[PDB]
Design a protein around this ligand. Structure first.
Ligand SMILES: Nc1nc2c(ncn2[C@@H]2O[C@H](COP(=O)(O)OP(=O)(O)O)[C@@H](O)[C@H]2O)c(=O)[nH]1
Ligand SMILES: [Mg+2]
Ligand SMILES: [Mg+2]
Ligand SMILES: [Mg+2]
Ligand SMILES: [Mg+2]
Ligand SMILES: [Mg+2]
Ligand SMILES: [Mg+2]
Ligand SMILES: [Mg+2]
Length: 140
RNA sequence: GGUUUAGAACGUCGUGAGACAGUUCGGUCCCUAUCUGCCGUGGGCGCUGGAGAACUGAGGGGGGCUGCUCCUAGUACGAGA
């Protein structure tokens, strides 16, 4: 019946300031789980999540897009977990979208830049996550 | 080709011949370079005995233009775009 046990389900979001690497980190996720044959770059519009023509041309995420993966482990340590990742936007022009995805998800991976670190949109996603008390981790 | 020759016509001016910063069609553009100048190329002599070659280098000339794509780099800057 149920393909994967309830414990092996992750509904996660990738939230942070504009251009912290969120859309790339999602491409490298879809790559290390084999679902996409090409790595693709955000600047060259190759990114699958950036499907809208505006997203391809301007290299920005103007919407939330959802994808799935099967991450066994680094050494196949665990049984394949079905991670539902909905890539989100960081532009203040689209905050409803990040809160929209943020509410349902059980965890958030907050991207950051090593040069800048805490940025305005990073505080914005922080306050939004804190009000909904989502458990968080961070990726620099 | 235009402008300004001789032909002809329009409009206008004049009685007229003709005329118009008015127009219209047609209408002969010569020279074998003496000298300077310049581009080449040699003959004479000189450089102190004659000759063959290899050069130094004062000086002179030639050349000096730039686009686009990628890497750095979505890097610095920018809340962003
Ligand atoms: N140097 C470098 N550039 C990165 C890295 N991750 C992403 N980028 C680039 O930085 C830009 C912004 O990243 P992106 O994933 O589009 O951010 P998002 O729009 O917030 O999801 C894009 O041109 C990416 O290719 C990284 O680790 N290093
Ligand atoms: Mg993005
Ligand atoms: Mg005659
Ligand atoms: Mg010269
Ligand atoms: Mg010279
Ligand atoms: Mg580029
Ligand atoms: Mg950019
Ligand atoms: Mg723009």
């Amino acid at each position: 019946a149920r393909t994967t046990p309830i414990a092996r389900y992750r509904n996660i979001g990738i939230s942070a300031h504009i251009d912290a690497g969120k859309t790339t980190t999602t491409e490298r996720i879809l790559f290390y789980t084999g679902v996409n044959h090409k790595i693709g770059e955000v600047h060259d519009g190759a990114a699958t999540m950036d499907w809208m023509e505006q997203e391809q041309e301007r290299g920005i995420t103007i919407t939330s897009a959802a994808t799935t993966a099967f991450w066994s482990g680094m050494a196949k340590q665990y049984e394949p977990h079905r991670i539902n990742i909905i890539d989100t936007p960081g532009h203040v022009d689209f905050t409803i979208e990040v809160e929209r995805s943020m509410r349902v998800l059980d965890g958030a991976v907050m991207v950051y830049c090593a040069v800048g670190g805490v940025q305005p949109q990073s505080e914005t996603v922080w306050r939004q996550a804190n009000k909904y008390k989502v458990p968080r981790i961070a990726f620099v």
